[PDB]
C-alpha cells in the first residue's frame, strides 16, 4: 500500500487545497 | 498498385503480393491490408476516420 495509497492521498490533499479551482471541479457546468 | 500476380498490389521490399481486395496472397506479409473506418457523404465524397 504505497504507490496507490500515496498517489491517491496526495491527489486528495492537492484537490482539497484547490477546491473549486481545478477543471475536474467545474467540468460539470460545461459537460452525455 | 496493379503489380504482382493478382492485379492488386505488389510490395517491392520483400515480395508480398496482394489482390484487388488488399488481401495477402503470396510472400511474407501475415495480414490483409488494413481497412479504416469511413462513411460516404451527401456530396458524393467519403469521410475517412
Amino acid at each position: 500500500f504505497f504507490e496507490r495509497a500515496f498517489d491517491q492521498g496526495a491527489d486528495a490533499i492537492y484537490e482539497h487545497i484547490n477546491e473549486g479551482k481545478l477543471w475536474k471541479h467545474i467540468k460539470h457546468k460545461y459537460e452525455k | 498498385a496493379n503489380a504482382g500476380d493478382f492485379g492488386g498490389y505488389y510490395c517491392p521490399c520483400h515480395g508480398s503480393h496482394y489482390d484487388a481486395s488488399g488481401r495477402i496472397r503470396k510472400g511474407p506479409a501475415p495480414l490483409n491490408l488494413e481497412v479504416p473506418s469511413y462513411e460516404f457523404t451527401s456530396d458524393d465524397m467519403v469521410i475517412v476516420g
Partner: protein, 365 residues
C-alpha cells in the same frame, strides 16, 4: 605503454591481423568526419536533405568530408568482415570474452550505420528506417507498441529523424569505449597466430615490428578509401537516396546498403514474417555460438584441409547471398537464395563441427 611499445606479440602473425587497427582507424575517421558533418547538419525533416546538399555544395571541402564519411562506412564493414573471417578461420573465438565483446561491437556498428543512413532523409533513408524499425513488430503483442514508441508516432516522421541524429551521434563513442574493453580482454591473453599454437616461446616487441606494419596497413586503407572518394564516390552507394523521402511511394527496386545484402537475402528467403526476422537475428547472433560448436582438437584451420574447404564454401555462400540480395524476388533467384540461406546455417551448425570430428579421427585423437 601497455597497449603498444613493449607489448609481446607473436612473431608470425600475418596481414590478417592488421584489420583490428584498421577498424580503430575507420572508427576515428568516422568520428572526425562525422563531427564535422554534424556542425552543419540539421535534423528537421524540412531541412535535413537540404543541409546535406549545402554541405556538399557550399561548405569548404564539405564534399570530401561527406563522401569520406559515406565511403568510410563501407571501408568499416569491409574491415569488419575480414576481421571476423580471420577470427573464424584461426579459432581466435576461443578468447570468449574478446570474441563476445566483438559480437556486440558488430551489432552496434550495424545499428549505428543504419541510423546514419537515415539522416540525409532520401528515399532509401526513409524506407530503411521504416523497414528496419518494423522488425520489432514481429515481437508478439507489444511489437507494434515498441515500433511506435521508437518512431515517436504512428509512422516515421519528424520525431524519428531528430532522435536518430542523437542516437547516431552518441553510439560511436560508446563503440569506442566497448572497443577499448575488447582490447583489455585481448591483452590478458595476447594474440592468437596462424598456427593456432601458443607463441609464448617466440614473442617480439610490438614496436617497431607491428607499429610499422600497422602504419603500412593504414596507408593502404587510406589509399582504398580515397580511390573511392576521389574517383568513384557513388560506386558503393544507391542512386535512390539522391531523391528526397516520399512517404507515399517506395521505389520499385529498393534494396539495402551492400553490407546488409546477405542478411537481406536470408530474411527474404522465408515466406513468414516472424520466421524471417528470427533468421535475420540468428544470422548474426550465431557468431556467439561458434565457440560452442568447435569440435577440432586444434585451434586453427591452418592444419585442417576439410575445415578450410568448408570455410571457403561459407565465404562463397555469403557472396552468393550478397548477389541474391541484389536481385528481384523472381525465379530462379528465389530458390537459389533459399538454398544459399539453408547452406549458411548448415555449414556453421553441422558441416564444420562434423568435419572437425572427422579430422580428429584421421589424426587418431
Amino acid at each position: 605503454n601497455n597497449a603498444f611499445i613493449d607489448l609481446p606479440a607473436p612473431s608470425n602473425i600475418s596481414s590478417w591481423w592488421n584489420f583490428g587497427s584498421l577498424l580503430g582507424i575507420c572508427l576515428i575517421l568516422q568520428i572526425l568526419t562525422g563531427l564535422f558533418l554534424a556542425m552543419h547538419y540539421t535534423s528537421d525533416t524540412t531541412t535535413a536533405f537540404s543541409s546535406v546538399t549545402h554541405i556538399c555544395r557550399d561548405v569548404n571541402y564539405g564534399w570530401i568530408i561527406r563522401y569520406m564519411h559515406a565511403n568510410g562506412a563501407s571501408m568499416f564493414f569491409i574491415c569488419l568482415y575480414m576481421h571476423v573471417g580471420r577470427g573464424l578461420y584461426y579459432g581466435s573465438y576461443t578468447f570468449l570474452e574478446t570474441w563476445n565483446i566483438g559480437v556486440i561491437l558488430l551489432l552496434t556498428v550495424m545499428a549505428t550505420a543504419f541510423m546514419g543512413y537515415v539522416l540525409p532523409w532520401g528515399q532509401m533513408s526513409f524506407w530503411g528506417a521504416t523497414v528496419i524499425t518494423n522488425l520489432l513488430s514481429a515481437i508478439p503483442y507489444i511489437g507494434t507498441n515498441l515500433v511506435e514508441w521508437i518512431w515517436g508516432g504512428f509512422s516515421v516522421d519528424k520525431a524519428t529523424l531528430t532522435r536518430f541524429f542523437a542516437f547516431h551521434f552518441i553510439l560511436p563513442f560508446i563503440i569506442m569505449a566497448i572497443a577499448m574493453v575488447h582490447l583489455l580482454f585481448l591483452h590478458e591473453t595476447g594474440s592468437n597466430n596462424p598456427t593456432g599454437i601458443s607463441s609464448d616461446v617466440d614473442k617480439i616487441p610490438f614496436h617497431p615490428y607491428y607499429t610499422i606494419k600497422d602504419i603500412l596497413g593504414a596507408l593502404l586503407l587510406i589509399l582504398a578509401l580515397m580511390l573511392l572518394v576521389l574517383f568513384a564516390p557513388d560506386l558503393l552507394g544507391d542512386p535512390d537516396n539522391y531523391t528526397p523521402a516520399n512517404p507515399l511511394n517506395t521505389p520499385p527496386h529498393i534494396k539495402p546498403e551492400w553490407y546488409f545484402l546477405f542478411a537481406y537475402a536470408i530474411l527474404r528467403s522465408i515466406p513468414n514474417k516472424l520466421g524471417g526476422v528470427l533468421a535475420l537475428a540468428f544470422s548474426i547472433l550465431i557468431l556467439a555460438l561458434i565457440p560452442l560448436l568447435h569440435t577440432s582438437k586444434q585451434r586453427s584451420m591452418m592444419f585442417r584441409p576439410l575445415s578450410q574447404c568448408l570455410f571457403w564454401a561459407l565465404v562463397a555462400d555469403l557472396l552468393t547471398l550478397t548477389w541474391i540480395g541484389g536481385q528481384p524476388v523472381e525465379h530462379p533467384y528465389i530458390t537459389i537464395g533459399q538454398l544459399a540461406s539453408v547452406l549458411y546455417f548448415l555449414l556453421i551448425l553441422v558441416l564444420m563441427p562434423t568435419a572437425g570430428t572427422i579430422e580428429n579421427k584421421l589424426l587418431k585423437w
